[PDB]
Amino acid sequence: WTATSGSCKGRCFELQEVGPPDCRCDNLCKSYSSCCHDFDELCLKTARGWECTKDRCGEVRNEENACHCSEDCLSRGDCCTNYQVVCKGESHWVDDDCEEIKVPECPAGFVRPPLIIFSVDGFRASYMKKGSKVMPNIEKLRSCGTHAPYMRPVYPTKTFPNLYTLATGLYPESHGIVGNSMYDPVFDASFHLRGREKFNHRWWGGQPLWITATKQGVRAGTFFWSVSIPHERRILTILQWLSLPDNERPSVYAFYSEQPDFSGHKYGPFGPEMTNPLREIDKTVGQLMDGLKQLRLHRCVNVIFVGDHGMEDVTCDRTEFLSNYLTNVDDITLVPGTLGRIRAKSINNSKYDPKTIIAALTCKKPDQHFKPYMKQHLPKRLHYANNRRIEDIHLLVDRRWHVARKPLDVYKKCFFQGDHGFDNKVNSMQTVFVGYGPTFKYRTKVPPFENIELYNVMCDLLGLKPAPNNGTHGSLNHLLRTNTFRPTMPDEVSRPNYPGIMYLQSEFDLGCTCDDKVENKLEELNKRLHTKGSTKERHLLYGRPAVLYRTSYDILYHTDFESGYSEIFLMPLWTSYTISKQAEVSSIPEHLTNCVRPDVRVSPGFSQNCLAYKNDKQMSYGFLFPPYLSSSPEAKYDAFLVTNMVPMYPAFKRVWAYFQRVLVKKYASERNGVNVISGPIFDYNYDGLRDTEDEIKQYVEGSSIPVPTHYYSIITSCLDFTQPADKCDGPLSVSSFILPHRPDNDESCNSSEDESKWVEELMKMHTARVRDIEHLTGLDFYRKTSRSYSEILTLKTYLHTYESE
Template identity: 65%
Template structure:
């Protein structure tokens, strides 16, 4: 992953260039493949991005676009890569580039005029002028925002790292020195039943349509529920931009690493150190660039993961074909959580559920209304009726593959999506900036709480959400919202221990 950040204070614009499209190859051990998204078949690519890179206003069809989501919507102008995704010269200065003659084809510059023009590589001052890198400086408490003139509020930059298992932080300064310097807080979980994106693949019975990450249906807004932070910001007059996530007082960037290599190599492979170093280098580039422009005491920064990573392997797979049911009558979303839907909507899923019970099986079958309530994974029509909650490290599939390309070989050694009470599913939260408490660790929390925190950092009124506003006030220096306790409506009375009443709430609990 290479991300080059540039903050242009004069126009209050945050820009992040993200060059990352590697995924595991189809065969184990093959190198990551570069994914190139073709130009749109529906939007004309005529026109130019010269002078328009990452424009704030999206060009409407039939015009081509140069904003940060044009790749996602297959609507970029034909010269978008040439003008907006420059890679020539690399993304950092080297000693032989210091004082170079300006080359406008370079992605960033190391010439003497780069500071005045605002386009230096992020390590220009450190390498060419002898300034200290951010990571080498002393840990300091930022008592208040120190922002250049023209800033209404401290901007918020959020970097989401995919599949960053919390235990990766134990690798320390040898692998992730920049992340080591940031404050560490842990969290887990989210409520997909409320926002409607219940999985990477799903079926909506009302739409009679399927959603997955490869098809164009993912771009249809009818699937999306809830309100993400950047929409809340825009509705309340605060500029926002995202990269790789559905300028700039709030800015979000999502990285596919270390998830891609975590799947391929497993969470305990020494080779995983390389993608972790890449992520840490990105954070180092960001912090050096902010320091170079005297913004490192102005901006609030959040580094957050979406989930952890657990060991997994093809040899630890349950096959539904070994159970007394006809697998041709069902649709199964396979993997670390088996989601089953009958092909015939009129069939009885309860009968299907009752057959999935054998003494040695590595999953627990549930009707969705009986899943542990802490999962918050039932109240949505897109959630299948039957679920197989897998043991950690185990997968579920419909039947044994008939013709494997390479028998005995497995293309993955890690996965996620297991029960979020498992420690390996936990991820990280790092908060840094003038609004965060200094060197403070808080108790673990669910990541649904972060929306309210980000609203507080930006002075926004949160939209309705599943979080508890104010629950993370301990991490903020001056939280703007203080929750109030509900008023008691009945006076306390002494309890009668001789006639205790037992109430059956009708819940199905997971006691493990």
């Protein structure tokens, strides 16, 4: 109930929202149908349009007009945005030369440069180049300020998850807005873009920028807008708030545009109809910049021009139907479209089996345009599992395609030609970032980066301490002229032990055998030096990783590799080795096929054992440092130490052996040497964070050997590939992966073929950031380099995407 019989007189676009049953006058009242009776009349004036003309100059004020051209308008803060241009001989902002903003040039009373965030829905990254001839204002912001060639959205690449990620610096799994459409099984409620349900605060987690600012005494309202408020009126409202008294005026502002997304869904990303919406958005930026220039704020404010996601070509006829795969299609509920999410129709149904649904959807048609996953099996880079609103069954849909339950869902609603929501590494889903103002750099291009990083930067821009979030604070310092945050390396929590030779062979009863008894002071001191760390500078190029939790571990040195060996998990946490361009690949000798050797530095009680692998009919083993890459037949014995062994399913060993025997050498050839760090990951509760010992759900049968959920590698070389990896003087280049440790290769439809036809494709799908591995391991990498810490943080957030240009 609303008593709509109050008034908006003197209250138009008020900042403090007033509580029902009293009527409202704020920018959201229309969405709630709760505006006062006279809101349209007083707050949504339209008379005489949005622009001054020559005949209107110095007019007598008429309060009915949409905006004003009278002499008093500048002091009232309510001129039309072109007033100085038409009536005072001023130039439009876009026609002015660009001039470096070295210091903020603000009116008296401004405590700090305001921040204006201009967000555009569906603004695909390539629009910046392809539409540049029709977007002169946007082109000036881009060429004069700081810009990236593209910005990576979060998955799913939908509106509400991405806009709220921009506001919070959190993954959708953490902020709770996991789709444009969501069902919560605990609320027994569905969230849609259309409807009142989305108004309930129970959906919205984390701490958005407006709340962060308000808590710290910086004034800021929410970033939402009612759709029916026209763009010209949103801009005039922002400019009027900027003319408020010092004690009343906000420091952060948000404009939102529904375009170009709206027309993109109808016409496709590059439909001829798309030129006009891009023109109209550019005109709106022009209105803002002209308005700022009138108020002498155009060299004071920091402006961020930012998109939520791009747009792909998608039509009705490119739809896969679940009724073509399943027979029981009426026992499921599907969230459809550019992603699929599947749950049971009824919770009273104990005859609902996710296993049988997955099997009936796996590699069933040769051209199949989607792939089913249990959520914990999705690529870890998506960070899309740790929330009750994310269904156990997920469908990853090919770009350009849709999934639907039954044909009747599609014709009983071709309409549309565009859509979005696909994997966030897809080129068509990439969006835009431009920063312009005193605090951003001048005429500067930055590498592509993830939208999760922006919350920290906006906090820096406003002098705020960020709430805990998923950005890496310092990784975007290169965007800023000043206000840089000074990041520092986390302190190491556990110091390693360095064990010497402490155990005789006969103390071990591991059930292992090796043909190694086949037997010089020249070469005995030599190998003693190797065991002491003489080759360590070759194989550990960036220092040892720091362990950021409490644990018991040993450093083990060898000719060809170094490791950090966990006495708790009975295997390395990390294994580090360098392979030059000139390195040679060899075989495992016949006599060494089943060789496993006790390590006389490590107790029998803290070792794995061969008998457990013999008894476990499902589980086999592999090695972290590959025997194929030994530097000599004598060094090869080190690779068969029990302390280099890890548990591996035979299906996974096909993947791992191909990576070790073929791909490491190929990368060494291409990149002029590589340094590799490899290791296990345990994430049984799919939270993206390292498991404690008591979270492990699976062991090698009848032992205390824990089974990893994933295996990682981090592959580093010189950015200047004319220098070898082990003698690099400048910036680094990295690619990394987090491969799921699965007992089948059901994910790869071509797995019955030779590894050369499917393994590398799998690895590409499971590409990762160094920072993702750090979360999953409690390790901190690149501790000892010649590079600045901010640069290393940028390197740790890099993702190698394997898309074209």
